[PDB]
């Protein structure tokens, strides 16, 4: 029995399994549970702290992947199923992974706190593309993520009910974050200096945390990676999720809220997710139906509200987009496009699938879209038009918003850096047109490419050790900079007036200003005002 | 009549003229200036359509310019010659409907063809004897007959009371056409072709230039057109009936004119000339530059329906124009009425001053409109620079007045036949008295494609020079054939046609002819195809 992979944490022994990395030996606690299966009467709960255990606890494997649809697409394809659940799908999903080096770090080390993408609707920590192996190998790293349930499970709400209050997906989180707190000491974590990460909706999540009081207290330091807490997608008012709730119950047989909810509580999980999608008001791209919700209570006002009026002195930020953020959505019901194909559209198509990529729009804001993403030398180009198609989705969905929160941040005293990611992985299976496609940093981050039999180029195997360290330096010291690499050039702060940020491709860090600047000022100044009228 | 040159007696359908022999640097040019067209259009005829001159006997004197309609004159900067040049150089007086003709000397041999030039200035001035539109150096260099007329501006020539008898509006435009009648009847004597006849203007002139193309009874006078830096379509060429009426009973209650039209014009009738000057500009609806009170209107009769609706359903097919713009259309509008701008420092504005200018660069703006101006033009890396800001003023009123009205002249009249050539024209006169910031501001070309630098004692570059006889020869060369191109010329780059598939058009520059395509593309779909829908709902 091997004394370096038994930790005792406050409710019980667990055993790990050593893992090996191409550089060394780490430590791997798989599947370890932080919360009471949130099943049964449970469903739709807050989750509430896992129960103390006998014995020693087998930690060696990871566990559940919380209930999700599951995508079919594209069957058997690779770009598709590498976000498909790699385990069992079940209820009970509430487990937590965690890697340190081998052996145990000898002082205290900063915690990364990873949080999966999936559009609140999927995800699992226990992907491929998230392993924690590289980062605790290479650079000594505690690495920490969480299942957290996603639709219906982590997010239908009946707001102002006891039994389906809202955001227990990103309670599951939180409690996390407080199990770390408590935690990770054993592990020689420091839990007085946690980093969350996350992309997409883990993005999203992060913010939401720093916007969130009681989260504030359990980390230091965030990266959101292609997503946001504010924008179009992240978050329902109460109307509209009790909205949606309510007509899911209806299209399930079911049946005052604690009637409502007992009935939804009888229903088969796979029940819930097969009507999930049919709660959208509109025909669209990047909608999701259950997701967090204004609740006046874990969110106390509009993601853009709180950040309108926080006050951030006191934060370190590292927040960025990849390079062609919307083209992987366009697939998923936008007529003329596919992955088989160059998807050249028409200029017809273009009118009608902005129509769904911003679902909202009146006729003349969809016309002002229109007017703003065309090529007026070439207005009728079919790889222009499918190119802006892209464009409109990801500026509407990822950049503006991220634009606005790095904002706004800066404007109110954080600490901000930012990046556009251009490289694509030599590795893609999706098609060419789709560029780098919204996702396609996370194996970047996390190391993917020191892996030899996964065959990156070399180049890209640099790269990634290059990303690795901009992100655990981050985690470190709240600065992406070598602090000992005195050849240039620096990666600078995001601030209001010089809005500069940094391109991380196979080059040197190139520093630009203005992220998309003239084009956020549209989504962000002048959309909204043309929607009051 | 036997002693004096026997090469200046000519006969017209009014009578005998005589003209004189003038000085150009290559040599002797014949001009007859001064030759009435109309009857003097004063008293009982104020407001009406010019009737044609009456003949006269013994031989008219036809040795220099006549009286400059009644007109504002610029005060704004007195003894500066960027503001003097355009005031009025002879006297203002209401009889003032006469035109100029400048011919080789002697005459022509064989039928030439004939350039006739539409000055602007608002419809609320201009004269055709300005220094900068003397004909002498087409006619000596380019071996053109060049004929200029005065029309009545301001409310003497736009003033309308539409649908009644005695003030119909558009009466100045008819002055225009009088003299097109003339040139059709007489220019042979000049040993012009009245069957080669291309109409040229600058500004108010060149939205003169496109009422003729629009206006059926004109379209049999001449035969291409050239627009410069004017259009017909726009937000200032024209008013609908509605608001002439409203603007001219304004002006009528101003002067103390009180109720049918026809007490209403005869009392206006009447007033004197420079009581309807001194109130022109009181009838403005909102504060604003690049509009003017008196304007061409809409009358269901010379224009049939709005100029946007004449260009996107008329037949083009057999017409020809040469169209464009210079660098800077607005720079010099921002002085008269924008706070914060002026000719005498660098103007640099604030970010209040820019959106304060918005409004009045585009006083037809709801809120939501200006905002939408305001979010375009602002550079979002650095808002409140105030250089940019300054360019942004320009550029919003020089866009939104003159390129985007353009460009679509060009585009309309592409698609629907014609042979249109485009240009942008982006020298800076080296003798230019407005500030550096201003660029190269409306009309600054005109001295140019007159070839004034051609006189030697005006002090500009030998390049210049060189450059003035290139656009003269562009300009000549298309009222000859209908191409700028030489034919003769292979070396020379070629000014390929406008089209709406390749949007190509050329830079006019000291250096050769370089070929663009896309004028302002993006920002005219804002202007064009946006702010209207935008100012709908
Ligand atoms: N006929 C039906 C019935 C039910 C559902 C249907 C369709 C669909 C659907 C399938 C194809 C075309 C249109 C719609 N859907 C799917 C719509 C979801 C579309 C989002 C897919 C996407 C595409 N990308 C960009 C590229 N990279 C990723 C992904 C995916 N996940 C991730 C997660 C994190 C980061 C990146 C990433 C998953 C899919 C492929 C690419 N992100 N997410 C359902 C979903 C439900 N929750 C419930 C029911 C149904
Ligand atoms: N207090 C008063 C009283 C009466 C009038 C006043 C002001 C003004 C005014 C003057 C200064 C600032 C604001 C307003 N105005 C306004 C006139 C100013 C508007 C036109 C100025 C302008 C500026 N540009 C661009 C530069 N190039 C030119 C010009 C001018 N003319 C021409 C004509 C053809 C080609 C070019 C060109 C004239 C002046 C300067 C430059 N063109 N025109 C009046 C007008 C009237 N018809 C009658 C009365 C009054």
């Given at each position: 029995?091997?004394?370096?992979?038994?930790?005792?944490?406050?409710?019980?022994?667990?055993?790990?399994?050593?893992?090996?990395?191409?550089?060394?030996?780490?430590?791997?606690?798989?599947?370890?549970?932080?919360?009471?299966?949130?099943?049964?009467?449970?469903?739709?709960?807050?989750?509430?702290?896992?129960?103390?255990?006998?014995?020693?606890?087998?930690?060696?494997?990871?566990?559940?992947?919380?209930?999700?649809?599951?995508?079919?697409?594209?069957?058997?394809?690779?770009?598709?199923?590498?976000?498909?659940?790699?385990?069992?799908?079940?209820?009970?999903?509430?487990?937590?992974?965690?890697?340190?080096?081998?052996?145990?770090?000898a002082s205290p080390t900063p915690v990364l706190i990873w949080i999966y993408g999936?559009?609140?609707?999927?995800?699992?920590?226990?992907?491929?593309?998230?392993?924690?192996?590289?980062?605790?190998?290479?650079?000594?790293?505690?690495?920490?993520?969480?299942?957290?349930?996603?639709?219906?499970?982590?997010?239908?709400?009946?707001?102002?009910?006891?039994?389906?209050?809202?955001?227990?997906?990103?309670?599951?989180?939180?409690?996390?974050?407080?199990?770390?707190?408590?935690?990770?000491?054993?592990?020689?974590?420091?839990?007085?200096?946690?980093?969350?990460?996350?992309?997409?909706?883990?993005?999203?999540?992060?913010?939401?945390?720093?916007?969130?009081?009681?989260?504030?207290?359990?980390?230091?330091?965030?990266?959101?990676?292609?997503?946001?807490?504010?924008?179009?997608?992240?978050?329902?008012?109460?109307?509209?999720?009790?909205?949606?709730?309510?007509?899911?119950?209806?299209?399930?047989?079911?049946?005052?809220?604690?009637?409502?909810?007992?009935?939804?509580?009888?229903?088969?999980?796979?029940?819930?997710?097969?009507?999930?999608?049919?709660?959208?008001?509109?025909?669209?791209?990047?909608?999701?139906?259950?997701?967090?919700?204004?609740?006046?209570?874990?969110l106390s006002d509009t993601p853009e509200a709180l950040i309108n009026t926080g006050?951030?002195?006191?934060?370190?930020?590292?927040?960025?987009?990849?390079?062609?953020?919307?083209?992987?959505?366009?697939?998923?019901?936008?007529?003329?496009?596919?992955?088989?194909?160059?998807?050249?559209?028409?200029?017809?198509?273009?009118?009608?699938?902005?129509?769904?990529?911003?679902?909202?729009?009146?006729?003349?804001?969809?016309?002002?879209?229109?007017?703003?993403?065309?090529?007026?030398?070439?207005?009728?180009?079919?790889?222009?038009?499918?190119?802006?198609?892209?464009?409109?989705?990801?500026?509407?969905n990822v950049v503006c918003p991220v634009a606005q929160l790095a904002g706004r941040?800066?404007?109110?005293?954080?600490?901000?850096?930012?990046?556009?990611?251009?490289?694509?992985?030599?590795?893609?299976?999706?098609?060419?047109?789709?560029?780098?496609?919204?996702?396609?940093?996370?194996?970047?981050?996390?190391?993917?490419?020191?892996?030899?039999?996964?065959?990156?180029?070399?180049?890209?195997?640099?790269?990634?050790?290059?990303?690795?360290?901009?992100?655990?330096?981050?985690?470190?010291?709240?600065?992406?900079?070598?602090?000992?690499?005195?050849?240039?050039?620096?990666?600078?702060?995001?601030?209001?007036?010089?809005?500069?940020?940094?391109?991380?491709?196979?080059?040197?860090?190139?520093?630009?200003?203005?992220?998309?600047?003239?084009?956020?000022?549209?989504?962000?100044?002048?959309?909204?005002?043309?929607?009051?009228?």
């Amino acid at each position: 029995e091997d004394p370096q992979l038994l930790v005792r944490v406050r409710g019980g022994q667990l055993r790990g399994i050593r893992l090996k990395a191409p550089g060394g030996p780490v430590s791997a606690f798989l599947g370890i549970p932080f919360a009471e299966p949130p099943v049964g009467s449970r469903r739709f709960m807050p989750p509430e702290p896992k129960r103390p255990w006998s014995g020693v606890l087998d930690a060696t494997t990871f566990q559940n992947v919380c209930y999700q649809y599951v995508d079919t697409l594209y069957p058997g394809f690779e770009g598709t199923e590498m976000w498909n659940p790699n385990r069992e799908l079940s209820e009970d999903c509430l487990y937590l992974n965690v890697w340190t080096p081998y052996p145990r770090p000898a002082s205290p080390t900063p915690v990364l706190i990873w949080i999966y993408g999936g559009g609140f609707y999927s995800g699992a920590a226990s992907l491929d593309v998230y392993d924690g192996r590289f980062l605790a190998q290479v650079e000594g790293a505690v690495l920490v993520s969480m299942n957290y349930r996603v639709g219906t499970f982590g997010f239908l709400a009946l707001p102002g009910s006891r039994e389906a209050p809202g955001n227990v997906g990103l309670l599951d989180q939180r409690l996390a974050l407080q199990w770390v707190q408590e935690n990770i000491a054993a592990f020689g974590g420091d839990p007085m200096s946690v980093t969350l990460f996350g992309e997409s909706a883990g993005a999203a999540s992060v913010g939401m945390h720093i916007l969130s009081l009681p989260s504030r207290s359990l980390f230091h330091r965030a990266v959101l990676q292609s997503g946001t807490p504010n924008g179009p997608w992240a978050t329902v008012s109460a109307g509209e999720a009790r909205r949606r709730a309510t007509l899911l119950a209806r299209l399930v047989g079911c049946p005052n809220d604690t009637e409502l909810i007992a009935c939804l509580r009888t229903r088969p999980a796979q029940d819930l997710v097969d009507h999930e999608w049919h709660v959208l008001p509109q025909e669209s791209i990047f909608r999701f139906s259950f997701v967090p919700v204004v609740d006046g209570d874990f969110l106390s006002d509009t993601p853009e509200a709180l950040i309108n009026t926080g006050d951030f002195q006191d934060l370190q930020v590292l927040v960025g987009v990849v390079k062609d953020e919307g083209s992987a959505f366009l697939v998923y019901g936008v007529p003329g496009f596919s992955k088989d194909n160059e998807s050249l559209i028409s200029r017809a198509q273009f009118l009608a699938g902005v129509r769904i990529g911003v679902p909202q729009a009146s006729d003349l804001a969809a016309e002002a879209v229109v007017l703003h993403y065309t090529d007026w030398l070439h207005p009728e180009d079919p790889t222009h038009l499918r190119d802006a198609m892209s464009a409109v989705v990801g500026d509407h969905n990822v950049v503006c918003p991220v634009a606005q929160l790095a904002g706004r941040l800066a404007a109110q005293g954080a600490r901000v850096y930012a990046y556009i990611f251009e490289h694509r992985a030599s590795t893609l299976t999706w098609p060419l047109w789709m560029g780098v496609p919204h996702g396609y940093e996370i194996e970047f981050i996390f190391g993917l490419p020191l892996d030899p039999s996964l065959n990156y180029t070399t180049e890209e195997r640099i790269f990634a050790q290059r990303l690795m360290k901009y992100w655990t330096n981050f985690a470190r010291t709240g600065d992406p900079n070598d602090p000992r690499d005195s050849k240039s050039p620096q990666w600078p702060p995001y601030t209001t007036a010089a809005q500069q940020y940094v391109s991380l491709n196979l080059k040197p860090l190139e520093v630009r200003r203005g992220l998309r600047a003239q084009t956020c000022a549209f989504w962000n100044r002048f959309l909204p005002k043309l929607l009051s009228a």
